[PDB]
Amino acid sequence: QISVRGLAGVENVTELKKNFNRHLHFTLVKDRNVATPRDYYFALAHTVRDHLVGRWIRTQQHYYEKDPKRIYYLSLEFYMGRTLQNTMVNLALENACDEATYQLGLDMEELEEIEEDAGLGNGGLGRLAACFLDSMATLGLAAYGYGIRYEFGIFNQKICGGWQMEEADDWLRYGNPWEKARPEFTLPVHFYGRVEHTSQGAKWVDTQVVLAMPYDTPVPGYRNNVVNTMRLWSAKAPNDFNLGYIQAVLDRNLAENISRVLYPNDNFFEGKELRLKQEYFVVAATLQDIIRRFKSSKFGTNFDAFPDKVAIQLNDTHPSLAIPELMRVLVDLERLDWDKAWEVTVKTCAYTNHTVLPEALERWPVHLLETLLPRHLQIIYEINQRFLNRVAAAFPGDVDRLRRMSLVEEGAVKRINMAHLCIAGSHAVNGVARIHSEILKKTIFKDFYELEPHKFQNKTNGITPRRWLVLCNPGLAEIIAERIGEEYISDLDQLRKLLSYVDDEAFIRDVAKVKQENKLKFAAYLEREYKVHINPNSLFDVQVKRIHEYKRQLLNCLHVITLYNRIKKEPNKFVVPRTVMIGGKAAPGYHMAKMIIKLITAIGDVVNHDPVVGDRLRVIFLENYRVSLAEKVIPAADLSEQISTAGTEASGTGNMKFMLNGALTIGTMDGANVEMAEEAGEENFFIFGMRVEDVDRLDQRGYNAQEYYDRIPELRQIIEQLSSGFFSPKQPDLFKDIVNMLMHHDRFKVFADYEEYVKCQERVSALYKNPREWTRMVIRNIATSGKFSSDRTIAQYAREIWGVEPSRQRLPA
């Protein structure tokens, strides 16, 4: 049907049809008479999978022969979503499969919906890893993603009586056609035990062994015939485990619990032993695999060349144990001297920081590490001593600097600061947006920057334009390709060419047409799947992201209520109609976030059923927000809410997705919003509120929320409504915790940005009244979104950190 979806040749369509029928028969053991739609999905997935394997085998053959420097991306999260459409896109197979399935009497889009998300992440950090894998393969890098194969990913969110309920994400129930078990590369991982000292150094003995079994998933590059590997470890008990008899077999579960479930915390540290075990498990298995691959290479014992052949990227501090584990292996097993081992480690490792929120920083109790990983604690103590000796020599007599920079934190319970470990043991430390990287050098890591300034870098985040434009918004990808060709898909900077179409009446009409179609499709999805009705002519106002106080879903709530109250006051006055959509999951133990969800639904209950409002205002909570839902809602959005308190959202990536898909942005000067506004021009963004400097000024004086309550009558009314039980008639005090937080202990200064936010929203409504000028501003956003491709991000990592050159060159097919 459309150009960007590739060719549907007679030869290819015929071959796909017969291979589809082969899999249905031989693989699924079914025929057309008994086959369910799920069977048809699997037949298609196996058919597409077949096209991957030849390229997969020859890519890994190529790496073995050429022996390039290998990039190892270590992450506890890979938020992959669905794989079928992505694979078709990257292989130029979409139209052919569409035709083949059409001729078999099937609707391909219907089959696509059957696939489970691989929801092995929480939000931004996990999705960044997924975008990164796509870009590394597209740029021809010899890259491997290493993580854990969770049996249960992020929970499925159900809303019951307005409250969030969690259920197990049993994503492997029907099987995963994309993965290949590799039980032949199973590796032992050690826990507990004790340290023994001999003539030949230290020995870690009396350990408990858990096996790590790898599962490999292919990662196709965009039309370059490169297929890289994501290798995820699964925990397995050894066969002599605990070996009355029956109980010993049943107790195998204890070891295998390591890879059972993803910790559902977004930007929050929980110091549980099982989490620590997960972190070491991924690190220990991965490092053995890396070293094995290094020794068994065409290069040729000598670890001097280790950093020339290996780069390890730590995604946050979660895999920080890679640093002392590498030291352990090099010193204890390979018998290298400390100084040489340390040189190798530092040159190999690099660390990406994802947040400055104190509650998200990993600080492990010494007593946990003492019991679980006794040798690693000893190594960390030695790292600390040698590091602090360097600090003392650089800043003599500065005793407070010594305590501030220590990897060991003193107190009631001694803790290890994993961020400090990462900085000391890495040759590069990066933040994820310009403002964030500056904040790191000026505030939380100031001491480290003063000691080693060369270590600190910026790498602004990005998103893959394959998943986040071509896949989810084919209508927009096509109208763009009509004007400027297809090269932009792997060179997003080419979107700048669209600036010469801002006055083109044909293009203006097509851009607006694509948005309306997307909105109609999403309005239809909501009715079919959730029996909720919306007006497709209204402004689609959306905030989708994890529920967090710093992200200020509550500020959005205050605006919604302001709009409702203004309508109730002057009912016969015209207002631009809005559909306000808010979605995202709360961590199960995060009480305030659960209360915010309940608030949003409670507002909906009042607003959506008030006859005086009509279809002028609707508030909908988008249930079970996840990658597949993002692919549907983002292309449908008109307004993107990016309203974190300045200085709290390190980068954001949802913001970039909305920009690429034709939504305008209302936001604070926070994270990547700053660079987005810079790229598009401030005139083409809806920027409001305190800057970082204004927040600091308010902190020094002291934030008093009562001041705002006293001086803003519209804000006062809302607080009275919440307190009196207007939004909860049967439980009048339901939201007392929310009011109390807002009035007395609000770390994120919701009230301080309220006035500017509401006024800015008025400007948004004004522009939306003029469709032509709205669309022209939209074109100016899309056209300048090029910087935010993860291809740009990865090229910077490659050149400035990993010391490798990207390549757009095709491998032979």
Residues near its own copies (CB under 8 A) are 25-26, 29-31, 36, 38, 50, 53-54, 56-57, 152, 155-156, 165-168, 170, 173-175, 180-181, 183-184, 236-237, 239-241, 243-246, 249-250, 252-253, 257, 260-261, 263-264, 272, 274, 588-589
Q: Is 25 helix (H, G, I), strand (E, B) or coil?
A: helix
Q: Give the CA-trace dihedral at 484, 488, 489, 493, to 10 degrees.
A: -150
For ligand RDD, the closer of residues 182 and 810 by Cβ is 182
Give the nearest distance from C-beta 597 to ligand RDD in angstroms: 43
For ligand RDD, the closer of residues 64 and 299 by Cβ is 64
Cβ-count burial of 512 within 10 angstroms (0-12 exposed, 13-18 middle, 19+ buried)?
A: middle
Confirm or deny that 119 is annotated as ligand binding.
Answer: no
What's the CA gap between 796 and 474, in Å, rounded? 28
Size of residue set near ligand RDD by CB under 6 A? 7
What's the CA gap between 50 and 93, in Å, rounded? 12
Per-residue interface string for the shown chain with ligand RDD, residues 150-179, x marking contact by CB under 6 A: ------------------------------
The answer to the question of residue 299 lying near ligand RDD (CB under 6 A) is no
Instruction: Name which position in 293, 347, 414, 441 contacts ligand RDD (CB under 6 A).
Output: 293
Give the nearest distance from C-beta 249 to its own copies in angstroms: 5
Instruction: Name which position in 10, 34, 160, 393 contacts ligand RDD (CB under 6 A).
Output: 34
User: Do 120 and 153 touch, CB atoms closer than 8 A?
Assistant: yes
Give the nearest distance from C-beta 505 to ligand RDD in angstroms: 55
Active site residue 496: no
For its own copies, the closer of residues 154 and 534 by Cβ is 154
- Of 56-64, 258-266, 608-616, 778-786, the window that binds ligand RDD (rule: CB under 6 A) is 56-64
Q: What is the largest CA-CA distance in the chain?
A: 90
The answer to the question of residue 296 lying near ligand RDD (CB under 6 A) is yes
The answer to the question of residue 36 lying near ligand RDD (CB under 6 A) is no
Give the nearest distance from C-beta 165 to its own copies in angstroms: 7
Cα 289-241-194 angle, rounded to 5 deg:
70
Catalytic choice (46, 70, 354, 415):
354
The answer to the question of residue 300 lying near ligand RDD (CB under 6 A) is no
Confirm or deny that 169 is annotated as ligand binding.
Answer: no
- Work out whether strand 578-583 and strand 639-642 pair parallel, antiparallel, or are unpaired: unpaired
Catalytic choice (23, 51, 149, 657):
657
Confirm or deny that 294 is annotated as ligand binding.
Answer: yes
State the binding partner of 682 from its own copies, ligand RDD, none, CB within 5 to 8 A by kind.
none
Q: How far is CA 550 from the centre of its chain?
A: 17
Supply the DSSP symbol for 770: S
What's the CA gap between 456 and 624, in Å, rounded? 37
The answer to the question of residue 721 lying near ligand RDD (CB under 6 A) is no
The answer to the question of residue 298 lying near ligand RDD (CB under 6 A) is no
Give the nearest distance from C-beta 306 to ligand RDD in angstroms: 15
Give the nearest distance from C-beta 297 to ligand RDD in angstroms: 8
Cβ-count burial of 137 within 10 angstroms (0-12 exposed, 13-18 middle, 19+ buried)?
A: buried
Which residue, 86, 91, 105, is CA-closest to 24? 105
Confirm or deny that 31 is annotated as ligand binding.
Answer: yes
Confirm or deny that 18 is annotated as ligand binding.
Answer: no
The residue ranges of DSSP E strands in 432-566, in sequence order, are 456-458, 539-544
For its own copies, the closer of residues 186 and 535 by Cβ is 186
For ligand RDD, the closer of residues 65 and 410 by Cβ is 65
Give the nearest distance from C-beta 582 to its own copies in angstroms: 22
Residue nearest to ligand RDD (CB): 64
Supply the DSSP symbol for 537: T
User: Do 623 and 159 touch, CB atoms closer than 8 A?
Assistant: yes
What's the CA gap between 91 and 48, in Å, rounded? 9
Active site residue 354: yes
User: Do 696 and 671 touch, CB atoms closer than 8 A?
Assistant: no
The answer to the question of residue 62 lying near ligand RDD (CB under 6 A) is no
- Of 60-68, 73-81, 418-426, 447-455, the window that binds ligand RDD (rule: CB under 6 A) is 60-68
What's the CA gap between 276 and 257, in Å, rounded? 13
State the binding partner of 293 from its own copies, ligand RDD, none, CB within 5 to 8 A by kind.
ligand RDD
Confirm or deny that 295 is annotated as ligand binding.
Answer: yes
Give the nearest distance from C-beta 235 to its own copies in angstroms: 13
The answer to the question of residue 198 lying near ligand RDD (CB under 6 A) is no
Confirm or deny that 757 is annotated as ligand binding.
Answer: no
Catalytic choice (551, 552, 749, 780):
551
Instruction: Name which position in 18, 25, 37, 64 contacts ligand RDD (CB under 6 A).
Output: 64
Which residue, 156, 146, 133, 137, is CA-closest to 80? 133
For ligand RDD, the closer of residues 146 and 281 by Cβ is 146
Confirm or deny that 442 is annotated as ligand binding.
Answer: no
Expressed in angstroms, the distance from the first to the final Cα of the chain is 25
How many residues in total does the chain contain? Answer: 813
User: Do 314 and 349 touch, CB atoms closer than 8 A?
Assistant: yes
Give the nearest distance from C-beta 172 to ligand RDD in angstroms: 22
Give the nearest distance from C-beta 132 to its own copies in angstroms: 24
Handedness of CA 6, 220, 79, 151 (dihedral sign): positive
Q: Residue 239 CB: number of other CB atoms within 10 A?
A: 8
Instruction: Name which position in 1, 36, 61, 740 contacts ligand RDD (CB under 6 A).
Output: 61
Q: How far is CA 17 from the centre of its chain?
A: 36
State the binding partner of 272 from ligand RDD, its own copies, none, CB within 5 to 8 A by kind.
its own copies
For its own copies, the closer of residues 241 and 757 by Cβ is 241
Confirm or deny that 293 is annotated as ligand binding.
Answer: yes
Q: Residue 341 CB: number of other CB atoms within 10 A?
A: 22
Active site residue 568: no
User: Do 298 and 64 touch, CB atoms closer than 8 A?
Assistant: yes
Active site residue 545: yes
Catalytic choice (318, 515, 546, 598):
546
Burial profile 759-774: b = 16 or more Cβ within 10 angstroms, e = fewer: ebbeebbebbeeeeeb
State the binding partner of 296 from its own copies, ligand RDD, none, CB within 5 to 8 A by kind.
ligand RDD
Helix 591-607 and helix 553-569: axis angle, to 10°?
20
What's the CA gap between 387 and 381, in Å, rounded? 10
Task: Tell which phi-psi region holds residue 193, choosing left (phi > 0), alpha (psi between -120 and 50) or beta.
Answer: left
For ligand RDD, the closer of residues 187 and 739 by Cβ is 187
The contacts of residue 738 (CB under 8 Å, 6+ apart) are 554, 592, 595, 596, 599, 722
Active site residue 66: no
What's the CA gap between 282 and 189, in Å, rounded? 9
Which residue, 83, 62, 227, 214, is CA-closest to 143? 227
For ligand RDD, the closer of residues 229 and 665 by Cβ is 229
Catalytic choice (653, 668, 775, 793):
653
For ligand RDD, the closer of residues 65 and 400 by Cβ is 65
**Which CA distances in Å does 228 have to 139, 178, 405, 800, 811?**
11, 13, 39, 22, 12
Instruction: Name which position in 60, 257, 723, 765 contacts ligand RDD (CB under 6 A).
Output: 60
Active site residue 515: no
What's the CA gap between 672 and 354, in Å, rounded? 13
Give the nearest distance from C-beta 72 to ligand RDD in angstroms: 12
Q: How far is CA 233 from the centre of its chain?
A: 20
For its own copies, the closer of residues 116 and 325 by Cβ is 116
Provide the annotated active-site residues. Answer: 354, 545-546, 551, 653, 657
Residues at the annotated binding site? 31, 64, 292-300
**Binding region for AMP:** 31, 64, 292-300
* Contact footprint for ligand RDD (CB under 6 A): 34, 60-61, 64, 185, 293, 296
